[PDB]
Structures are given as C-alpha cells and as structure tokens.
Design a protein around this ligand. Structure first.
Ligand code: BJX
Ligand code: ATP
Ligand code: ATP
Ligand code: MG
Ligand code: MG
Length: 1204
C-alpha cells in the first residue's frame, strides 16, 4: 500500500500541505522549504544541457536539439498526461447527454458516478501535466542560467567584443529571454494538445447536432485569429505605454534626486506639470491599451454566444427534428470546453514566437568572442593584441623579479594596463610566450570594481578574516577615517545598491582587497590615480613598501608618480606598446642617460606644479561629503484581506462608474442565465413551430452580446479613471511634503511607489478585478441555478462551501509568502550576473571563477526552489478546487436524477455544475492576485496620506510688496534652529544684523550649523524660537513660494535639469531672451552657449553632464542673476570647482552682485578675511560676529585659528 499512498501524495500534492498549513502559524521562508533534489539542482541540469550542447557542436549547434535531448522525456510524459486529461474532459458532455436521455450504461446513477470518476481522473492528470512541465521549465531555466554564466566567465573584455551594450544584453538574457524560454516550455504541450482537443470537440459537436454544429464550430473557431490580432495590438499599445512611462519615470527620478534644490528655488510645481504632461500622454496610450483589452474580453465572451445562437437557429431551421435537451446541453458543454483552447492557442503561438527569438539571442550570445586558453613572470618576444589583428603590444620582452617591487612607467596610452592584462591573459597573444615561475594574482584594476556587499566583504573577497591583517591593510590604505563615517562601518553595504563612495575611496578599497589576499603576486594598475599626495605617499610607504615586503610579495605597480621610482627594485619603461628599456634605476641611468634626465625633468615639473596646488584637499572634500550624507541618519494582519483598500480603489473612479460596472455585470450574467433557461424551456418542448423560441433566443443572445460589450468597456473605463486619479494625487502630494521626508525615506522606495505600484494600478488591477468579478458571478449563478433545479443541493452547499473557505483561506496566505520569497530571490541572482559582467578581469586575475560559479549555482537553486514551491502551491489549490467541483457535479447529478423537474432543467443543472469546476480555482487565484495588488494600492494611499509643508502664509499677500527683498536687510533675533521636533537644536541664540548690500561671510568648523542658517533663510529647516526679518517682513509669516522664489541660493554641487538652457535659466519663462543672454554674459558663459547648437535652446543632459562642473556652477550663477533677488546665498559654491573657475566665480560675484547682499559660507576661510560682517559658528553657537579685520586683530580667536 506504500507505493499507492506515495502515488496519491504525489498526485494530490500532499507534500505541500504542511507547508501551506504552517503559513498561518509563521511566514514561509527559505529555511521552511528544503533544498532542491539532486535531479533538480541547477548543476545537474547544467551538466545535462551542456552535454547535449557539446553533442550538437560535435555535429551551427542547435539550442533546440540540446533542449530536446536534455529535457524532452518529461515533456513527453506531460503530453501523455495532457492527452489523457483532454480525453477524460469530453466525458463531461457525453455523460450529460447520457443522463439527460435517462443496458448497464443506460442507468443514470451509473453515468453520474462515471462522470465523477472521469472528472477526478481528468483533473489529476491535468495537474500532473502542469506540474511536470513547470518543473521541466524550471530545470531548463537553471541549466540556461548556468550556461550563460559560464559563457560570461569566458567572455573577452576587449572594446571590440565587450561593448557598452554587452552588459545590457546580458541582463536582458538573464531577466527576459531565459524567462520567455521557460514560459514557452511551460506552455509547449498546449501547442499540440489544444489543436487535437479542438478537433475532437468539433467532431463531438458534429456527432451531436449534424451539420448545424459546423456553423457554430466555424463561428467559435474564428476566435483564435481574432485573439491573435487583438494580442498584437495589445503588445503595440503596451510598448507605447512603456516608452511614455519610461520618460515619466526619468522625469520623476530627476525631480526626486534634486528635490531640495527645486524646493529652494520654488520650481517644484513647474516640474510637476512637466511630469503631468508625460503622464497624460502615457494615459492616452493606456487608454488605447485598455480599449484593446476590453475588445479581447468582449470577443472571448461574445464569440461563444454568437456561435451558440448560430448553431441553434441553424438547427431549428435546417434540421427536421425538434431540439432535444441532451443534444442542446451536451453541445453547450462542448462549446464551453472549446472556448478556452481557442482563446489561449494564440497566447501559446505568441510564446512560441518569442521563444524562437529568445533562442536566437541566446545562441548568438553563446557564440561570442572569449578569452583564449629569480623571475616570477617573464614575457619573451610577446606580441599581444586586443582582437583587431593589429598588435597593441609589439616585441614585449620583460622580466618581473620574484619578491621585488616592479614599476611600469610610461605616458598615457603606452599600454601599461595592456601589458598587465596580457600577462594575465586577457588579450590575444599573436606571438611570444609568457612563463610563470598560471597563478592567482591580486589585481587592483585601473577602474575600481566593487561588489554590492559590505566593506569587509569587499576587502576580504572570499578569504579568511584575520583581524591583524585586516587592520594592517585598512591602515595602509587609510580607510579607517572614512569607514568610521559610514553608518555601519565595515558592515556598510557599498557599491551600486549601497552607499555611494568617492572614486578615491573605491580605489583604496580595491587596493585594500588586493593587499589583503595572500597571493605572492600583486598587480596594481594606477592605484594613486584618484588619490592625493598624502594618501598616495602613506599607501606607498606602509602598503607597498612595508606591508607587501613583510610578506615578500611580487608587486607590479603601474604608476605615473615618477618620484616613487627610487623605491623600485625593477623598472619597466614603455612607449607606444613597447618597452624602451628595463632594469634597475641605476642601470637605466647608466645605459639610457636621456631617459633618466627626462624622468628627472618630469619629477621636477610635477613637484613645481603640485607645490601651488597642494592647498586643495581631495580627501577632506570626500570625507566631508561622506559625513554630510550621514547627517540625516502579524498573524491577524496576514489573513486580513484589505477590503477598505478595495473599496477606496473602486470608488476612486467615482460612484457612477462603480454602479455602472456592478449593474452591467449583474445584468449580463442574468441574461446569460436567461439564455440558458430559454434553451432549457425550448428543449423541454420535445416538428412544432420554432418561431417563438427562435425569436426569444435571438433577442436574448443579442442582449447578452451587447451587455458583454458594455461590461468590458465599463471595467476598463473604471480602471483608467482610478489609475489617473491615484497617480495625479500621489505626485502632487509627495512633492509638497517636507524635505525631511526625502532625507529620511530612500529614493528607492519613492521611485518604487512611482514605477511598480503605478504600473500595478494601471495595468494589473483592472484585468484582475474583471476576472475575479466574472468568475465569482459565474459561480454564484451556477450555484443559484443548481439550487433552483434541485433545492436539496443546498444541503450539500453547507459542507462544500465550508471546505472552499478553508481552501481559499490557507492558500491566500501561503502563496502570499511564496510570491514574496520568489521576489526576494530574483534580485540577488540578477545582480550576481551583473557583478560578473563588470569585474570579469578581476575575477579571472584572482582566479576566483569557481567561487563565483558556486555562488551563482546557490542563487539560482534558491530562486528555482522558491518558484517551484509557488507553482506547487498553485497545483495544490487546483487539485483541491477540482475535487470540490467533482463533488459538486456528483451531488448535482444525483439530486437531478432522483428528483427531476424536467429534462431541460436536468441538463441545465448538469451544465452549470460542470462549469463551476472551472471557475472555482480562478475565484481563489484572482482573489489572491487582487490582495497582492491592493497591497500596492495601499502603499500609494499611504504615500497620499502624508503631511505637507505649510505653503500658506499668515500675512496678507497684499501687505507683501511686489519687490519685497529690494534692499536686502536681514535681522536674526534669537534664532533657534532644529531639523525636526524631538531633536537637539542645531542653532542656538543666533543674533545678527546684516546690512543691506553687505557681504557677509559665514565660517566655522564642520558640523557647526552654517548650512542650517542658509536653510533657515529659506525655511527649509524648523525654526521654533526667534525670528528672521528680511527687509522688515518676518519670513515665518510668509507663503513658502513667495519667500523661496524671491531669494537666490547657490549650493556647493551644481545641478542642472534635463531640458533647454532657457528652461534651466527660468522654467517659469517670465524673463526675456535678452535678459537670459545678459545673464549668460554675466556668468562668463555667453560664448559657450553660442558655440552650442541653437544657443539658448541647446539640450542639457540630465544632471548637466554636457557641461563641466565649473560650467555648471557658472550656470547656477546665471540662474541666480536671472532671479534678481537682491539677497544671494552661496553655500560653499567655490568648493569642488577649479581654481581658475573659482576666480571667475569670485569676479562675477564681486562685479554683478555688488549691489546684492551676498551671504557666503566660505569654503576657504581666507576668502572672507575682508568681508564686512563675519559670523563664526561653533557647535551651533554664534561665537563671533564682527568685521573680518576686527576678528583678525583679536588674538587667540576662533576666526584667527581658522584662518591659520
Ligand atoms: C508558472 C506556470 O503557471 C501555470 C502554467 C500552466 C501550464 C499550462 O498549460 N497553462 C495553460 C492553462 C490551461 C487553461 C490550458 C495556458 C495556456 C495558454 C496560455 C496560458 C496558460 N496558462 C498560463 C498560466 C496561468 C493560467 C493560464 C498551468 C497552470 C499554471 C498556474 O499558474 O497554475
Ligand atoms: N579593453 C580594451 N579593449 C581594446 N583596446 C583597449 C582596451 N583597453 C585599452 N585599449 C587600447 O589599447 C591601447 C593601450 O592603452 P592602455 O589603456 O593599455 O594604456 P595605459 O598606459 O594603461 O594608459 P592610461 O594611462 O590612460 O591608463 C590604447 O590604444 C587603448 O585605446
Ligand atoms: N538633514 C539633516 N537632518 C537632521 N539633522 C541634520 C541634517 N543636516 C544636518 N543636521 C544636523 O545639523 C548639524 C549642523 O550641521 P549643518 O550641516 O547644518 O552645517 P555645517 O556645520 O556647515 O556642516 P558641514 O560643515 O558638514 O557642511 C549637523 O552637525 C547635524 O547634527
Ligand atoms: Mg592604464
Ligand atoms: Mg555646509
């Protein structure tokens, strides 16, 4: 009995049962799920698929043949199960005909029991086929991901091969093409099962109804081309909507990062309107998409009705016999059977075409350019090239002594990085040989590569953690001062996803990773490129010379700092892809005196140039940015369906639309039941005159078609209205919020609310709601009609319904976990592939390909097990609801046979009992989908219920003059500034009198509250005591727009917004082009604008990447001059700016802004030694407020110490 119970457990998915039941007790996690079986692990499937692919390559290789030879037998098994289920599905109409007709097989109860058994077997076989094909598709996805990851690990990094689009193509293959191929393998048995089922259904219809059934067969067969055409139009409209949504999301992201500047300039509403224009275009495209969706729904619901109408009218007239209940309702059952394959065969064909495209892309990727197969390293007569045939490195003959520092020196473009990568084997070897006396190399690439992991996980890089070595490595690279600034320290997730670091910090972290590894050979490729003199010298003295010589490492150091050549044991001088001369410094000097003299001249010139420029500190400005970035730093609910969120979404389109949808759907399903009952009455008159019944049937069918159209239009109209209203409210609501909200909430969360939740509301919810309402109404009408035919069925409705409740309860939570789990596993795996595409040279130099292969296999196995268990929960639910439906069919059949009203009613009840089995599962599935989507609607509403700023001022706008800050007086009385309630005040008792047209310089130590004062000028920070009176008007008693739009501010990092230069200068477009040209000339920028095509309407890239940072700062100066505020705030504007551009900025401020009151937070204190009023801040307290010379003459003063 053990094999029998094992087979039953497999067939009913009983092994999921416990995992479902536990979902109420505790959330489902990866620990609750087991591991993948050996036959299901990605490694075994990868080996099978790779063996098949290599067999094909032996013989151009066929991916399709490899997939068939690897994962073909399970497809044949699932096809056998699908054919058995299709055959056992036609027992429905046959048993309906037999029962309605009323030796042994003639018995009606025998036929009812046989129909029950046939339904149970059919559903078991169908779910088995679904599970087998889904498992095979998941195995194929794992194998394909492993194959493409190995191909990635083999990829060549040359610019000819590894282009800028290669990483995007890899991401597309991992995230899209592999999933398209997996879904095609999911749906492939349909491709040869649906045609057979359709042909057999048409044959059964013909056997039932003569040639009259061929008319309905043709009409309903017309549904497949119509659905294919409608799906083509849907794809086109979806691409259009996706383009418009991408533009809208680009604009929204540009607003969100940079919202502080927009609020300071009071340009938030202009950018909101700019986003709303793109939103309106996207909404028009979405309207076309919804129109085609409603067409699809209407056709799916109306072609069957027209086919039934044509069939039965043609039978009433052409056929000489009366319509019989058995034939009529068996044919109705056959039509209902045929609807689904005809509607979904177009989907299967579309997936087949997309799979052909995906296999073409995958096969074109699997055929890509890939890398080829004392003294530690020696190159003899080496001729290397980057794949173009032209040798980049010609006649390379070098020697790298073991355990000695080797420095490669040459001008930019010599081929030093090329020499290192040719030694590592990353480029083609035309001639020569590289001898290693390969081996693992600690490689620090010229472009630093960071994993999306913590600082410690980047530095250790798959190596055992040693605290002494880790501390020594961190000290040598001077990483502790900037690690301490990180929120979590070593455990701070850095990289693309995590905290953004400066180029110098990333370079030092990669150098630390190179130093930490205990490999005898270290390759450093310009490690001082993004560092300053002090950090470079410390790394050279402690890391290269001390730490790397304690371990006796063979160090190869590509550098431009020739001053370090005195520390070199071996020197390799390059020029134009060839070595001029190699050897010790003394040997080079003796043999090649000219090269030594040239090196001396270069060292002297570099020292002379750096002597003046050493004043600027790169590391100080990196650490200040990193420190400023950190200034800001349920069981009952699990099963609670969000009915309030559902009601809010339904009423967000208006009560008329909701009423129209509900009324139209109720009327449509009433009419459908009416046509079924009319057929019942017509057949129960069984040649009489058919005119009355034909006329009534035609009228009912026409009304049903019209109501199908009405409901299809109405649900999509409601969805469009709700989406429009929700997004329109959301954008404006979040923009008006305080700056503290944007400082606290990450940009990722807000952008998710604007992209993913918006897409869910726009395109996912309307179809889910339509399907849920349709399935629920079909089930309710079926139950009502079965109970009307036989009231005793209601007795069995109490148990079965109760069962249904539990079946819908547990599933609705279990899947909710599994889906989430699936998502939590999709993000890492994809990221892994990206981390391997960029950083491939580092991985292959460290020789850590095996570790990354293992990590990829783990990630894909986790993703596959999550997806498999989600699908298994779906199969569990389908089996449960299918057995419920079989019980319903058996009960209805027995009740109808025992107590018969008439033959037509028996047939009608049997048909409805048979049909409810299809929709019971979809009621639960759509309810779960609706709950998931209402989660996103709840997120959007939560963002919509946030608190905004107080944009309405106390003062009467008539009281405020037209030119309010005309003079520029400022009076700060007992100012107490905090960034949020319950936090400590950041400014305490600041009192100052800024004379109109007086140049004020604000200075102090880091964290003293200088930027907080500039924010208090704009009321971007919470003032709770004291006041700021600007030109006689308290700014607290003022609208925020009037205050912020009449004051000019210049921040440190300049930000320009995508659009025209005229748009950047004034989005409001109040000024004239002559004024804009005058401002551009003032900012010493008119010639640059003239050089650009179009002048004032030259396109600015997002962030202003077209212009240099100095040009961006000059643009900010031009905007400030356009504003004509007479009060200009400059928050360390000259920082991160070239010295020449800094002098230009100072000249512009002195000349053009001579009249305006300039309040400058000096980046360099010496710049405000001659300022009229100097405000010195210490720890939030105004220590000194006097003239510059007055503070200078007072010895031992804070300003005097700052100046020195
Ligand atoms: C992850 C794969 O998920 C499945 C995968 C399958 C495999 C399958 O032959 N589908 C047939 C469905 C039946 C009605 C023919 C089909 C055919 C064409 C288009 C879509 C579909 N189906 C696609 C999935 C959702 C239901 C319509 C079954 C069921 C599921 C499921 O979600 O439970
Ligand atoms: N990945 C690559 N694929 C193809 N060609 C490349 C690649 N990297 C560099 N080259 C080319 O090979 C030549 C050698 O330049 P390379 O980058 O090796 O010099 P370098 O001395 O390291 O220069 P730099 O000081 O600018 O870093 C140049 O013509 C360069 O354009
Ligand atoms: N966004 C913020 N949220 C909360 N507190 C903040 C925020 N920004 C700054 N603070 C707090 O206010 C203090 C005042 O520093 P602030 O940035 O205002 O000016 P600062 O002294 O000129 O700074 P820095 O020299 O680093 O640019 C900070 O030390 C910090 O404690
Ligand atoms: Mg280089
Ligand atoms: Mg500051």
């Amino acid at each position: 009995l053990q094999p029998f119970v094992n087979l039953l457990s497999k067939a009913t998915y009983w092994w999921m049962n416990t995992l479902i039941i536990s979902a109420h007790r505790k959330p489902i996690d990866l620990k609750a799920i087991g591991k993948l079986p050996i036959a299901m692990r990605a490694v075994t499937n990868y080996v099978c698929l790779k063996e098949a692919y290599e067999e094909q390559k032996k013989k151009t290789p066929s991916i399709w043949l490899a997939m068939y030879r690897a994962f073909g037998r399970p497809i044949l098994l699932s096809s056998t199960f699908r054919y058995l289920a299709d055959l056992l599905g036609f027992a429905g109409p046959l048993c309906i005909s037999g029962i309605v007709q009323r030796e042994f097989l003639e018995n009606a109860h025998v036929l009812a029991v046989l129909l029950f058994l046939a339904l149970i077997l059919q559903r078991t076989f169908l779910q088995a086929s679904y599970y087998v094909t889904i498992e095979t598709g998941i195995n194929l996805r794992g194998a394909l991901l492993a194959m493409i990851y190995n191909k990635i690990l083999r990829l060549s990094t040359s610019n000819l091969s590894m282009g800028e689009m290669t990483l995007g193509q890899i991401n597309n293959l991992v995230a899209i093409e592999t999933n398209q191929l997996m879904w095609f393998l999911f749906l492939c048995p349909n491709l040869w099962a649906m045609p057979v089922q359709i042909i057999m259904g048409v044959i059964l219809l013909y056997n039932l109804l003569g040639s009259s059934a061929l008319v309905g067969a043709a009409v309903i067969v017309l549904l497949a081309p119509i659905q294919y055409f409608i799906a083509t139009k849907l794809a086109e409209a979806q691409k259009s909507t996706l383009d418009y949504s991408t533009e809208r999301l680009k604009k929204t992201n540009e607003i969100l990062k940079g919202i502080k500047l927009l609020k300071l300039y009071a340009w938030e509403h202009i950018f909101c309107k700019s986003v709303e224009e793109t939103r309106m275009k996207e909404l028009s495209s979405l309207k076309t998409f919804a129109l085609y969706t409603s067409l699809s729904i209407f056709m799916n619901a109306a072609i069957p009705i027209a086919a039934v109408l044509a069939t039965f009218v043609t039978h009433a007239y052409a056929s000489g016999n009366n319509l019989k209940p058995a034939e009529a309702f068996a044919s109705l059952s056959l039509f209902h059977i045929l609807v689904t394959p005809l509607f979904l065969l177009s989907t299967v064909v579309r997936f087949a075409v997309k799979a052909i495209i995906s296999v073409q892309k995958l096969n074109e990727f699997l055929l890509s350019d890939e890398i080829g197969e004392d003294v530690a390293i020696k190159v003899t007569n080496g001729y290397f090239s980057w794949g173009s045939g032209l040798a980049t490195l010609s006649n390379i003959d070098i020697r790298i002594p073991t355990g000695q520092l080797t420095m490669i020196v040459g001008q930019v473009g010599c081929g030093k990085s090329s020499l290192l990568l040719a030694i590592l084997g990353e480029m083609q070897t035309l001639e020569g040989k590289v001898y290693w006396n390969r081996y693992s190399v600690a490689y620090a690439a010229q472009k630093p590569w960071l994993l999306n992991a913590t600082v410690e996980e980047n530095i250790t890089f798959g190596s055992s953690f040693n605290r002494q070595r880790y501390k020594a490595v961190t000290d040598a690279c001077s990483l502790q001062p900037d690690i301490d600034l990180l929120p979590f320290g070593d455990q701070t997730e850095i990289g693309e996803r995590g905290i953004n670091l400066s180029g110098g910090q990333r370079q030092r972290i990669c150098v630390a990773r190179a130093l930490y590894q205990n490999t005898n050979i270290v390759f450093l490729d310009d490690p001082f490129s993004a560092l300053d003199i002090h950090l470079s010298d410390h790394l050279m003295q402690e890391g290269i010379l001390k730490f790397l010589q304690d371990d006796k490492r063979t160090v190869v150091l590509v550098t431009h700092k020739l001053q370090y050549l005195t520390h070199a044991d071996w020197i390799i001088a390059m020029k134009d892809g060839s070595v001029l001369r190699e050897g010790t410094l003394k040997d080079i000097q003796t043999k090649d005196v000219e090269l030594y003299e040239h090196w001396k001249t270069l060292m002297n010139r570099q020292d002379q140039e750096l002597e003046k420029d050493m004043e600027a500190d790169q590391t100080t400005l990196e650490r200040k940015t990193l420190r400023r970035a950190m200034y800001s730093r349920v069981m009952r609910l699990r099963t609670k369906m969000p009915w309030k969120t559902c009601w809010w979404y339904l009423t967000s389109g208006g009560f008329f639309l909701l009423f129209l949808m509900i009324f139209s759907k109720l009327l449509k399903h009433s009419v459908i039941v009416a046509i079924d009952y009319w057929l019942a009455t017509w057949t129960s008159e069984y040649k009489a005159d058919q005119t009355f019944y034909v006329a009534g049937f035609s009228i009912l069918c026409g009304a049903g078609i019209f109501l199908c159209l009405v409901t299809s239009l109405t649900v999509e109209w409601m969805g469009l209205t709700a989406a429009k209203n929700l997004h329109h409210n959301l954008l404006n609501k979040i923009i008006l919020g305080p700056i503290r909200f944007f400082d606290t909430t990450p940009l990722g969360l807000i952008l998710n609310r604007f992209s993913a939740d918006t897409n869910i509301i726009d395109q996912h919810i309307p179809p889910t709601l339509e399907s849920l309402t349709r399935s629920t109404l079909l089930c309710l009408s079926a139950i009502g009609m079965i109970s009307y035919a036989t009231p005793v069925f209601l007795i069995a409705l109490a148990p079965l319904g109760v069962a249904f409740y539990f079946i819908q309860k547990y599933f609705r939570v279990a899947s909710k976990d599994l889906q989430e789990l699936d998502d939590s596993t999709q993000l890492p795996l994809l990221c892994h592939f990206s981390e391997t595409a960029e950083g491939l040279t580092t991985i292959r130099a460290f020789r850590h390909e095996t570790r990354f292969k293992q990590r990829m296999l783990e990630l894909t196995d986790t993703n596959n097990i999550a997806y498999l268990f989600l699908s298994a929960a779906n199969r569990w639910l389908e089996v449960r609801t299918d057995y419920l439906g079989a019980c319903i069919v058996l009960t209805a059949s027995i009740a109808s046979i025992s107590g018969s009203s008439n033959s037509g009613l028996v047939g009608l009840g049997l048909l409805y009992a048979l049909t409810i089995t299809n929709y019971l599962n979809w009621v639960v599935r759509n309810l779960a989908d609706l709950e998931v989507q209402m989660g996103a609607v709840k997120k959007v509403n939560s963002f919509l219920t946030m608190e905004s700023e107080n944009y309405e001022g106390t003062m009467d706008p008539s009281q405020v003059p037209e030119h309010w800050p005309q003079e520029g007086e400022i009076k700060i009385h007992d100012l107490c500034v905090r960034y949020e309630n319950n936090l400590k005040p950041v400014l305490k008792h600041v009192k100052a009198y800024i004379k109109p047209g007086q140049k004020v310089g604000i200075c102090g130590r880091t964290g003293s509250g200088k930027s907080s004062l500039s924010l208090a000028f704009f009321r971007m920070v919470d003032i709770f005591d004291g006041k700021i009176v600007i030109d006689g008007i308290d700014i607290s008693k003022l609208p925020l727009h009037t205050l912020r739009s009449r004051l000019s501010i210049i921040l440190q990092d300049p930000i320009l917004f995508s659009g025209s230069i005229r748009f950047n200068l004034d989005p409001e477009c109040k000024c004239t082009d002559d004024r804009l040209w005058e401002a551009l000339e003032i900012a010493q920028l008119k010639n640059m604008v003239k050089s650009l095509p179009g002048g004032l309407d030259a396109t600015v890239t997002e962030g202003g990447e077209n212009f240099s940072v100095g040009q961006r700062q000059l643009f900010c100066l031009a905007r400030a001059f356009v504003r004509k505020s007479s009060i200009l705030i400059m928050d360390e504007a000259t920082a991160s700016i070239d010295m020449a551009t800094e002098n230009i900025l100072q000249k512009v401020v002195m000349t053009a802004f001579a009249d305006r009151t300039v309040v400058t937070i000096a980046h360099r204190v010496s710049s405000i030694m001659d300022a009229g009023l100097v405000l010195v801040f210490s720890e939030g307290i105004l220590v000194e407020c006097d003239t510059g010379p007055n503070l200078l003459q007072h010895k031992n003063g804070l300003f005097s110490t700052l100046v020195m």
